[PDB]
Amino acid sequence: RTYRVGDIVDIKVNGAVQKGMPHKFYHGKTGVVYNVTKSAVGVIVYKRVKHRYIEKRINVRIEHVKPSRSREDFLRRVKENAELKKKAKAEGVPVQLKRQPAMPREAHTVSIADNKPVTLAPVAYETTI
Amino acid sequence: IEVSAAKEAMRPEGTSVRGDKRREIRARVKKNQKQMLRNQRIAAEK
Amino acid sequence: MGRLQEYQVIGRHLPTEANPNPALYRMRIFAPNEVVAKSRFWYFLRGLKKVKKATGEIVSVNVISEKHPLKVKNFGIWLRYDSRSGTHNMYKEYRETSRVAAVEAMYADMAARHRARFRSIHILKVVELEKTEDVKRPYIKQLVAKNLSFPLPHRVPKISTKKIFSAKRPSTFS
Amino acid sequence: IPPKPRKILQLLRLRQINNGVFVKVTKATAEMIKIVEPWVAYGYPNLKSV
Amino acid sequence: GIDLRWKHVRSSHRKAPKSDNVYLKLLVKLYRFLARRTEAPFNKVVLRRLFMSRINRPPVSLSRIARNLKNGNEKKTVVVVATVTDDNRLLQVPKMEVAALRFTAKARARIEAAGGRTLTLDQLALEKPTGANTLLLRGPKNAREAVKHF
RNA sequence: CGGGACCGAGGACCGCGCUCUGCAAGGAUGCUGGCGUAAUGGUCACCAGCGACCCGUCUUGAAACACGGACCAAGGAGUCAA
RNA sequence: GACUAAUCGAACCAUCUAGUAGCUGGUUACCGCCGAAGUUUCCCUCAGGAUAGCAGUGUCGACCUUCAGUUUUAUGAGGUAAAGCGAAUGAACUUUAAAUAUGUAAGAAGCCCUUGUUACUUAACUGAACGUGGGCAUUCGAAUGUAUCGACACUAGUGGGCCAUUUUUGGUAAGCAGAACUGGCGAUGCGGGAUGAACCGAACGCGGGGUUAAGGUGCCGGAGUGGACGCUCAUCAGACACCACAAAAGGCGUUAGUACAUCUUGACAGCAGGACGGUGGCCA
RNA sequence: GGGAUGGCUUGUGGCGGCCAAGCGUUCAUAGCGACGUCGCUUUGAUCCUUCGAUGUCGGCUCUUCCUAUCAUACC
C-alpha cells in the first residue's frame, strides 16, 4: 500500500520496539500526509497548548502508518442520506435523515416463570468452602 | 523524527531527513581523505 | 448506619440477540434508601458476576418489612470486615425485634469496638436463632436466662438542663 | 475548577451557584452531567416541582 | 459570583460625529429622524456615513461617477456622502443628478454646464426621503499613502 | 386557619383579569394619639462591645533583611525645539 | 610614595560642565470603564537578544459567515480488565468486551456521475491532478450553548518566577532532581483552620430582610453540659491525624474475635498420697 | 551599588557467606526476612613506624538552667 499527499493516516508504532523509543506522544495520533518518500512519510499533527493549536511535522516510517477511516462514516451517511431521500421522494413518505442520541428505555414486563432469580450473598458460599 | 518547517521548505525535492546524518558523515570523511592524500603527497615529495 | 431498611433488589443484564432471556439476580441490601440500595447492588454484582451497571438494569426494588416487629428475637450475624491486616471473619449476636435493628446495632458495635466504617464491612448472613440453645455469646445467654429480673442502682434523675439551680440535693434511688 | 467541567457547566448554563436547569435525558447529556457530578445535584422532578 | 467566560462587548462603531459642524449636526438630526421613522436602509447607511470621518470618506471624481452611470444607471440620482471632485481626464461630462456633502467649484461648474443638477443631502432627503431610484457611491478607501505604507 | 419580622419602589387613565353596583387585578392606604421643640435629626469630646501591624521604596516568585522618615511652613522633578 | 598652607599613588582655583552611569533615591487631585504576563520558536553562551502568546484604545466591513478546552456517533491508541474454552486454539487463547482521559471526522463552502488533457502516475484511459457539464431544496443531514464575528491602525507591560494534585523519567543512607497537563499566587478583599504566601469554603458597588457553605454549639464565643450504642483511666491521656522514632518491638492493661485442643469416661487450679524394680546402667 | 540542616541528634562497623521463626507462594518454588553465626580487619608483648590547620579557640567576672550523677543521702 502506497500513500499520497493529502490523505489522512493513523500513526501506530507496531512491534516491541516501544522500550526506549524517545517520542511516544505521536503514537496513536492521526494526521494529514504532506510528503511521501519510499520508506518514510511526512505527517502533520496538531497539539493543544492552553487555548491555541500548534502545528507539528513528523517523519514516520511506512510500517508504523495505516490509512484512517475518519471520513468513512461521513461519506457513508451522505450516500444513504441521498439514497433514502430519493426513495422517500419516490414513495411520497417522510423519513428521518438525522442521527439521534440514545433515548431512555421504555416500560416493559419481565416474567419469572422459567427465570426464577438466584439469591447472591456478597461472597460465594462455594468460595467459602 | 520531528522536522522544522523551514528545514523542509529549504530541503531539496527527493531528499529526506533520513539521510542527513549520512550526508554529514560522507562530507567529514571526504575532507579527512583530502587531508590524508595531501599529507601523503607531501611525504612522497619529501 | 442510619435508619436502614432491607430491600429486595432484583436486577439483570440487558437482553441481547445471543441472550434474549438473561438470568435475574436477587440480593437483600440494608440501605438508607433505594438509590443507595441500587448502588450497593451494582457494586456487589461488579464484584461477583462481572455485570456492569451500563450493561444491566434493575428489574425490581421492594421493601422487606419485619414479619413480627413486636416479638423479641435473637439474631446471629456472620460478617467479614477489612483492616490493614486484611479481611477477617466475625460472628456476633444481637438481641432485637427486627433484622434492620440488628444490622444498625451491628454497625454501631463494629464502629465502637473495631473502628470499622460502612464500606469495609460485608454482611454475609443475618439469621434469627430458632432456639435458645442456638445462642452462643454469654452476653445474650445472661439475657435469655430464666426468671430474669434486675434492679437499677444509681439512677441519675432527669433534671432539665435549663434549670441551673436546685434547692435540694437529688437522689439516685429510683 | 478544571477547564472541561468549566466548559460543561457553561454549556449547561450553570454559571452561578444555586442555578437550576431542565435537561432532556439523552446519552449525550447524561455523560456531561456525569462529568460535572462533583459540582451539581440533579434528579427527576415531579409535576409539583416543575 | 457569576462565571462569565465571555465578555459583553461595548460598541466599536461611531454613534455621533466627532465634528463640531453645526450644519452637520442638523443633517445628523434629520437623518436620525428619517432612519428612525422609515423602512429604508438607505437612510441608515447615509446616517452612518455622516457619522464617519474624512479618511473613511474618500473623494469621488466625476470620472468615477460617469463610470458608474453606465448600463441603465443614466437616470438614477447619484448619492455620495463625501466630496465630489473634478477630473481633467474626463473631457465630456454626461448629464447627471448628484447629491453630495460638498462639491468642488470645478465639479459643480462642469456638472451645471453639462446640464445636470447638484444637490445637498437635505435636498436629497426632501426629494427622495426613502432613497428611491438612487445610485450610492463611495470613493477608493485604500488609495492613501498610509494604506500603501501599511 | 393562625402567629411574627423586614419592606411600600411608582405617581391622572390605558393592561391582563376576577369572586363583576365592585375588587386583594400593571408597587399603601385608611383611622387615631402625643408633641410642635432641640422632642426627632446632626457635629464634637469621652466611655463601652466587636474590629484593626508603620508608611513607603527595593528584592525576587514572595516574605524577611535593608534604606529614608523629630516636627511645621514655602518650594521641588516627562518640559521646549527640530 | 613622605612633604609641597588641616588638601597628595599627584596641591589649590575657575572654566569646559547642567560631563557620563546601564547603578541608588525620588517623581505632586479625584472618580469611572477595561485589564495582564515567566523556554512558543529561532539564533555561541555569559556582562545576550529578538519573537509567539496574553491587553487597551480607536475605527471600518453585510458585526457576512456561526463557531465551541463539552458530550454523542463512526474510526484509531490503550485489547488492558473481564466471560468462555458444554465456541476453535492455547498479557502473548479468543465470539464478545473494560474504567480514565485522548487523536481524526460529522455537508449545499458538501457529495458523487460524465467529458476531455496530463507536463504526475499506471502494463494500461488505469488511478489521481486540472478544467468541463449534470444530478442532488422534500427534510441541510447528532446533542447542548451561542451580547462569543472578522480585519486593520496605534499604544503598553510581561515574556528560563513560586507552590500544589496527577502522569512519567531517574535516584539517595535519608533527603530528592527533571519534564507534561491543570489549578492557585505574584494582582485578592471576605468566612473558617486560636495565629500565618501555599489549607478548606467562597470570590467583592452601597444598604435592609431571609437562608446556608467550610467550620462549629461546656465557658471565653453566636449556637446542645443535645439524643442512641459502645470503647478508654494515661506518674503531664486525648481532642488537625496521616511522616519519623518503629521493629516480624516490649506489656501478669482492658474488651471484641479467629483457629486448634481438653472436658461428668471428671477438663484447668488446688489439697491428700504414690513417684517404684533391673540399677550404684557404661566410661571417666 | 548591593550582601553578610532543623520534632536534626544519642550505645553497640562494613563487605561476603550460611542458618533462620515468620511474609508470600503453593498452574512458577522463586523472591523479602528479625534473632543469630562464620570469615577479613602478645604466653600479660614492644617501646628502633607520633602519617599534613581551608574550617579556631581562649581567658575571666558573674548569674541561671539541664541531667546524660564525680562526690554527698537512701536502696
Q: What angle do CA A73, A75, A76 make, to 5 degrees?
A: 60
Task: Calculate the angstrom distance between C1' of G264 and CA of C130.
Answer: 28
Name the nt closest to E9 by C-alpha to C1'. Answer: G147
Resolution in A: 2.5
Q: Rounded CA gap, C165 and C156, in Å?
A: 16
Q: Rounded CA gap, A115 and C21, in Å?
A: 8
SS (H, E, C) C62-126: EEECCCCCCCCEEEEEEEEEEECCEEEEEEEEEEECCHHHHHHHHHHHHHHHHCCCCCCEEEEEE
- CB distance from E1 to chain D under 8 Å? yes
Strands A8-11 and A65-67: antiparallel
Chain A closest CA to D10's CA: distance in Å?
16
AA letter at A6:
G
Q: Rounded CA gap, E4 and B5, in Å?
A: 38
Give the C-alpha distances (Å, rounded to integers) separating A24 from A12, A57, A63.
10, 15, 16
Q: Rounded CA gap, A43 and A37, in Å?
A: 12
Q: What is the grid cell recorded at E20?
A: 463640531
Q: What is the grid cell recorded at E99?
A: 447629491
Q: Name residues 8-47 of chain D within 8 A of E (Cβ).
A: 9-10, 15-16
- Judge E/D contact: 3 or more CB pairs < 8 A: yes
Task: Calculate the angstrom distance between C1' of G269 and CA of C135.
Answer: 28
Residues written for chain E: 150
The shortest CB-CB distance from A123 to any of C12, C25, C122 is to C122
Say yes or no for a CB contact (<8 Å) between A59 and B17: yes
Technique used by the depositors: cryo-EM
Q: How many CB atoms lie within 10 A of CB A111?
A: 7
Q: Rounded CA gap, C45 and C88, in Å?
A: 21
Strands C24-31 and C73-83: unpaired
Give the C-alpha distances (Å, rounded to integers) separating A91 from A42, A84, A97.
49, 10, 15
Question: Taking each helix axis from N to C terminus, what angle separates E41-51 and E22-37, rounded to the nearest 10 degrees?
Answer: 150
Q: What angle do CA C121, C123, C126 make, to 5 degrees?
A: 145
Evaluate whether E61 touches E88 at the Cβ level (below 8 Å): no
A110, burial (CB in 10 Å: exposed 0-12, middle 13-18, buried 19+): middle
Strands C5-13 and C24-31: antiparallel
Contacts of E22 (CB under 8 A, 6+ apart): none
Any idea which residue has 434523675 for its cell? C157
- Using alpha carbons, select from E130, E134, E144, E108 the residue that is nearest to residue E35: E130
Question: Taking each helix axis from N to C terminus, what angle separates D27-35 and D3-11, rounded to the nearest 10 degrees?
Answer: 130
Name the nt closest to A12 by C-alpha to C1'. Answer: G77
Interior/surface letters D2-41, b for 16+ CB within 10 angstroms, e for the rest: eeebeebbeebebeeeeeeeeeeeeeeeeebeeebeeeee
- CB distance from B21 to chain A under 8 Å? no
Q: How many CB atoms lie within 10 A of CB E60?
A: 23
Evaluate whether E55 touches E144 at the Cβ level (below 8 Å): yes
Q: What phi and psi values does residue C75 have, to the nearest 5 degrees?
A: -125, 135
Q: What angle do CA D5, D9, D11 make, to 5 degrees?
A: 115
Contacts of E83 (CB under 8 A, 6+ apart): E57, E59, E60, E100, E101, E102, E103, E104
Q: Rounded CA gap, A61 and B17, in Å?
A: 11
- Using alpha carbons, select from E103, E105, E101, E106 the residue that is nearest to residue E89: E106
Helix (H) or strand (E) holding E28: helix E22-37
- The dihedral through the CA atoms of C134, C139, C141, C145 has a sign that is negative
Evaluate whether C19 touches C72 at the Cβ level (below 8 Å): no
Evaluate whether A57 touches A47 at the Cβ level (below 8 Å): no
List chain B residues with CB under 8 Å of A41: none
- CB distance from D6 to chain E under 8 Å? yes
- Using a 7 Å cut-off to protein CB atoms, list the covered nucleotides of chain G: 33-35, 40-42, 53-54, 57-61, 63, 68-78, 81-83, 95, 98-99, 101-107, 110-112, 128, 136-154, 181-183, 202-204, 224-226, 228-231, 255-259
AA letter at E20:
D
